[PDB]
Design a protein around this ligand. Structure first.
Ligand SMILES: Nc1ncnc2c1ncn2[C@@H]1O[C@H](COP(=O)(O)OP(=O)(O)OP(=O)(O)O)[C@@H](O)[C@H]1O
Ligand SMILES: Nc1ncnc2c1ncn2[C@@H]1O[C@H](COP(=O)(O)OP(=O)(O)OP(=O)(O)O)[C@@H](O)[C@H]1O
Ligand SMILES: [Mg+2]
Ligand SMILES: [Mg+2]
Lengths: 557, 540
């Protein structure tokens, strides 16, 4: 409950100004009939001036409150998304995209809406009740009212936890439905290829049934709570009415001085009723914001970024007994005992069967995961010692199935660079990767917008754009992970000349992972990886005269 | 404006029950203050055995009945609007799946999810705040207009004077309000797409170290949304202030005309509070009716999506018990609907036979996957025709056709279910023996046993907890579990190693399957009976 009030602590000056305005307006509303502007003319123009001044103050208070609440909503929604992206990689395996999006975009909006609806009402009726308590001090009945008032707060405190326990579940159900929807909408050519629209509709209906089940309990609880707060207010009125009628006859307070207490009591009881009605909404708001506050309070398991930015860096990468276990499924080793060196000016190829662990090596080299039982060093220093942007500028990769974003071609090649590159550099990178042939033929050129996940491009064109995106950085450490799986015979010559004939190969160390064994013949080193272990190593010839697994793979037909 | 009532038609008994409880509630809270006054004016001497106790008991029972009816009305309204919101969500999601494939490229997935999440709740949350206020205001205006007995010409002057309550200003405010609500919803969808794209592609974002860029983009979108919200709030507050200022212009005129007539002084000051109350209540009624209309009209995008007809032909009715499997492209020319006037195919004509294997080769961007997608009836040709057993391929039933013509795509797409839920995808019933046979035929059963739970292992989202070759084998098994008649393989061995490539090379051991392979590398299509080489969309 303290987190909800602490999330609005960046606007303390504006809330204090609104509180001063509320106090002034309420004290004006409760001091009108005592004075009414005697003499000083005629009185109807004074009534007009009073109405105008009552309108202006309400306008100012509404403007201040609305501006403050908009700032609070935008700030909180920004901080939740900022906290989500700081987590580790495997955090995005337990949590799906639709669930995270429903947490970020919909739970925060609900929390902000509830907060903005309830805070001003609470402040208004609290100030109203606090003043009406003051002006009603028959003195003797006030302590009676104040000792019978905690009892009416006994029932909600035993109930409000229920209001949380429903709400969390409701939010979870909504997130699940969202994920289903997005998984149907990002793969429409596949779904229609198997005639499975009815299956997606049924999958949506399964979660909608759970939401429908929870809504009935919500409605029943709302009706029962309204009943209870109304009976509590009625009892609060009737008890003081009965004690006043009894005290009138037996001397004590005279009926003349007792009647004025009762008008004040009818308004104080209504203020107490409103304050009682607010509390279940506060418990519901605590229920609605459990996951986003868990995200905000979560600490990531990845090591933090370093502060090393050397001016000159070489592509000397060392593995020393590196093992990995993939913490989603621990106690099974994907890599056992890897130990190899990448030297600048050289190509090292990583060959092996399917599922052997080559993309795991590529992901370990990108500092996406930390090794379980070894050391991975870049120029004699660990990867977490370097700055995030510097390390991911120096080491670059393509990926097994490359991904592009929904923007123009010029900022897809230059995605992530802090200093924007010139159009001539983008043209040079596209010429180097072979993407210049089709981009120049497009009607808008490099400004051509591609859609979400690049549906307007074919596989080879997407691979060429990814290669150009990797090439624009001038990366000393280059990783290729099946980069020619969709390229034709004309576009493989560009990759071959990049690997073994470019002038820049002396400024790079290349790790090449392919199933096409024609590119492996000119590699400086070849490593055969089976079951996460390096079975063989050496050049092409030394692996051929020794027979073995590499010769078995090569002499397959 | 009338579709919403037709959609809310299955919620009629809850609505009429809520109205019954609402009129009971307003009757109770109307009748309470009279007996409260009877309770309080007994102060001139207390009566112990009677008078006081009867009055407080009657007030007790009146408040009890009013409270019970109010709680029942609130619960009924809450349940009704939850049901209506869920119905709108279900209908919109069912309508979205029928659209053509060009609809999903002009739109974005995060924006559609933002519509389905927020725009549906926008057209449901207003009634529990609006209906009770509007009905209470109407009841109080009707009751306060029942004070005709006081003075005769006052109501006749009132109706004519307060009839023009700034109609032009009301229309101006309603137009501006509807426009700003539409802009707010568009900005919210645009902000959601940023989170959509950043979270979905997190591995590439982390690999380039560009999370701060995505945070900055999201904060820019949030700033735009906040500016739109503040514009809406300032406009509403200014309109309310203008109304409250202009309310006095009739009150001072009536209070001057009473003095002008010199109905007495004791009766002239007997309805000023009544006049203020009835004016404020009719202003509130008009304002909340306008807010109702604007908030209903601001959600026209959801109505437009639910009444959108897809650009697809009439659905097929053919389902033969036997299919030969001969496929004919005749003079087929195609250009994509989202990017027209740039032809991809330029008069293709060929035949695919059941007993032969056909290879389709060409450079990048030549149009081979376009040929496959036209073969699977995913797009309609702009010229020529695609024939399956001498009939057009759009004349066959949707569920029948896609169990006979099956393809493995260029990039296989898996889902979040288990292994066997992906192998048996789209099938109403499938025994485990068929699933294991299809896994054996695709050489996938070797790595299935290595996973925990076997075929019940939770494949990750988009198949992200597997290798690429394992995903390829799962897609091949998913294609082969259907026992197809026409099988298309759009680079189906692009991730498998050498041994799995030479193991899966026949594709026609049955001898009665029309196979079309699409390949880039050679030395895998020597055994193809027919070879078709196409460059820039023209067969050579
Ligand atoms: N996110 C993940 N969580 C758990 N296990 C995973 C994950 N990604 C991969 N694996 C497993 O790790 C092992 C190695 O997979 P990896 O992607 O490294 O193979 P690979 O050698 O690149 O394969 P291929 O040649 O088919 O592309 C496999 O058994 C795979 O199922
Ligand atoms: N969804 C789409 N919308 C618009 N144009 C598209 C779309 N998909 C492909 N294209 C364009 O159509 C042409 C042919 O692409 P297609 O995918 O059919 O080629 P392909 O021969 O299968 O390619 P590859 O060998 O690279 O896989 C290209 O110019 C491509 O940019
Ligand atoms: Mg791999
Ligand atoms: Mg293709």
């Amino acid at each position: 409950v303290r987190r909800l009030l602490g999330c609005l602590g960046s606007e303390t000056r504006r809330l204090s100004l609104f509180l001063v305005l509320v106090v002034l307006s309420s004290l004006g509303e409760m001091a009108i009939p005592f004075f009414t502007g005697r003499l000083t003319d005629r009185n109807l123009t004074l009534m007009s001036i009073l109405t105008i001044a009552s309108a202006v103050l309400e306008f100012v208070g509404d403007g201040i409150y609305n501006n403050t609440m908009g700032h609070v909503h935008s700030h909180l929604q920004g901080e939740v998304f900022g906290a989500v992206l700081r987590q580790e990689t495997e955090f995005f395996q337990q949590n799906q995209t639709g669930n995270i999006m429903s947490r970020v975009t919909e739970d925060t909006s609900t929390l902000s809406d509830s907060l903005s609806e309830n805070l001003s009402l609470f402040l208004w009726y609290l100030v109203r009740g606090l003043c009406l308590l003051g002006i009603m001090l028959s003195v003797s009945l006030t302590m009676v009212t104040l000792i019978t008032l905690p009892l009416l707060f006994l029932l909600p405190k035993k109930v409000g936890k229920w209001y949380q326990l429903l709400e969390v579940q409701v939010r979870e159900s909504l997130a699940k439905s969202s994920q289903v929807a997005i998984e149907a909408l990002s793969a429409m050519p596949t779904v229609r290829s198997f005639a499975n629209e009815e299956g997606e509709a049924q999958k949506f209906r399964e979660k909608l049934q759970e939401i429908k089940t929870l809504n009935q309990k919500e409605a029943v609880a709302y009706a029962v709570n309204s009943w209870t707060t109304s009976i509590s207010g009625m009892l609060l009125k009737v008890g003081i009415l009965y004690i006043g009628g009894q005290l009138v006859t037996s001397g004590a307070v005279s009926s003349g001085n007792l009647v004025t207490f009762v008008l004040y009591q009818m308004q104080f009881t209504q203020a107490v009723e409103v304050l009682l009605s607010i509390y279940p909404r506060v418990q519901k708001a605590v229920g609605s914001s459990e996951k986003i506050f868990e995200y905000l309070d979560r600490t990531p398991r990845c090591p933090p970024s370093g502060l090393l930015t050397p001016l000159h860096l070489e592509g000397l990468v060392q593995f020393q007994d590196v093992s990995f276990a993939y913490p989603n499924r621990p106690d099974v080793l994907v890599l056992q005992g890897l130990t190899f060196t990448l030297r600048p000016g050289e190509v090292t190829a990583l060959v092996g069967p399917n599922g052997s662990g080559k993309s795991t090596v590529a992901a370990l080299l990108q500092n996406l995961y930390q090794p379980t039982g070894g050391q991975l060093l870049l120029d004699g220093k660990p990867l977490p010692q370097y700055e995030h942007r510097y390390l991911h500028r120096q080491v670059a990769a393509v990926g097994q199935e490359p991904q592009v974003f929904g923007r123009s071609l010029q900022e897809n090649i230059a995605y992530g660079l802090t200093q924007k590159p010139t159009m001539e550099e983008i043209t040079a990178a596209a010429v180097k990767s072979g993407a210049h042939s089709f981009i120049s033929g497009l009607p808008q050129g490099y400004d051509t917008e591609v859609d979400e996940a690049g549906s307007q491009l074919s596989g080879g064109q997407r691979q060429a754009v990814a290669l150009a995106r990797a090439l624009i950085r001038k990366p000393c450490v280059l990783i290729l992970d099946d980069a020619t799986s969709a390229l034709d015979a004309n576009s493989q010559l560009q990759v071959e000349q990049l690997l073994y004939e470019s002038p820049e190969r002396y400024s790079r160390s290349v790790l090449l992972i392919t199933q096409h064994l024609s590119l492996v013949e000119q590699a400086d080193h070849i490593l055969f990886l089976e079951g996460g272990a390096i079975r063989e190593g050496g050049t092409h010839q030394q692996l051929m005269e020794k027979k073995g697994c590499y010769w078995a793979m090569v002499q397959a037909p | 404006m009338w579709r919403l009532l037709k959609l809310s038609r299955p919620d009629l008994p809850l609505l009429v029950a809520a109205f019954f409880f609402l009129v009971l509630a307003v009757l109770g809270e109307t009748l309470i203050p009279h007996y409260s006054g009877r309770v309080i004016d007994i102060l001139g001497g207390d009566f112990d055995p009677h008078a006081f106790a009867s009055a407080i008991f009657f007030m007790c029972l009146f408040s009890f009945g009013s409270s019970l009816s109010a709680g029942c009305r609130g619960g009924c309204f809450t349940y009704t609007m939850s049901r209506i919101n869920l119905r709108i969500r279900e209908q919109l999601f069912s309508s979205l799946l029928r659209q053509d494939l060009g609809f999903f490229q002009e739109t974005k997935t995060g924006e559609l999810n933002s519509r389905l999440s927020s725009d549906t709740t926008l057209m449901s949350n207003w009634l529990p705040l609006n209906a009770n206020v509007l009905l209470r205001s109407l009841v109080k205006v009707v009751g306060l207009y029942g004070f005709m007995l006081s003075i005769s010409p006052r109501l006749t002057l009132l109706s004519l004077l307060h009839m023009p309550f700034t109609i032009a200003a009301e229309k101006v405010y309603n137009t501006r309000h509807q426009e700003v609500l539409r802009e707010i919803q568009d900005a919210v969808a645009r902000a959601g797409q940023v989170v959509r794209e950043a979270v979905g592609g997190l591995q590439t974002v982390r690999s380039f170290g560009a999370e701060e860029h995505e945070v900055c983009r999201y904060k820019e979108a949030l700033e735009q949304c906040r500016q739109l919200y503040w514009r809406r709030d300032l406009e509403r507050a200014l309109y309310l202030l203008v109304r409250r200022v202009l309310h006095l212009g009739v009150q001072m005129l009536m209070l001057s005309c009473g003095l002008q007539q010199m109905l007495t002084q004791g009766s002239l000051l007997s309805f000023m509070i009544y006049q203020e109350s009835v004016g404020s209540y009719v202003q509130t009624l008009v304002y909340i009716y306008g807010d109702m209309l604007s908030n209903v009209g601001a959600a026209e995008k959801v109505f437009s999506y639910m009444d959108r007809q897809p650009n697809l032909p009439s659905p097929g009715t053919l389902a033969p018990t036997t299919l030969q499997g001969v496929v004919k492209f005749q003079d087929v020319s195609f250009a994509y609907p989202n990017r027209p006037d740039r032809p991809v195919l330029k008069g293709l004509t060929f035949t695919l036979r059941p007993g032969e294997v056909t290879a389709l080769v060409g450079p990048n961007g030549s149009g081979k996957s376009t040929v496959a997608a036209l073969l699977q009836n995913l797009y309609q040709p702009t010229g020529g025709q695609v024939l399956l057993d001498e009939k057009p391929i759009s004349q066959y039933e949707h569920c029948y056709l896609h169990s006979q013509v099956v393809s493995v795509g260029q990039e296989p797409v898996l889902f979040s279910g288990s292994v066997r839920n992906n192998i048996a995808y789209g099938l109403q019933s499938c025994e485990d023996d068929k699933v294991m046979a299809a896994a054996q035929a695709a050489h996938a059963d070797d790595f299935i046993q290595e996973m925990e739970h076997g075929i019940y292992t939770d494949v990750g989202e988009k198949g992200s907890q597997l290798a690429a070759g394992q995903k390829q084998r799962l897609a091949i098994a998913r294609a082969l579990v259907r026992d197809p008649r026409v099988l298309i393989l759009d680079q189906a061995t692009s991730a498998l190693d050498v041994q799995c490539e030479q193991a899966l090379q026949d594709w026609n051991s049955r001898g009665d399957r029309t196979v079309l392979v699409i390949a880039h590398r050679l030395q895998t299509v020597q055994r193809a009976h027919q070879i078709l080489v196409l460059q820039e969309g023209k067969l050579q």
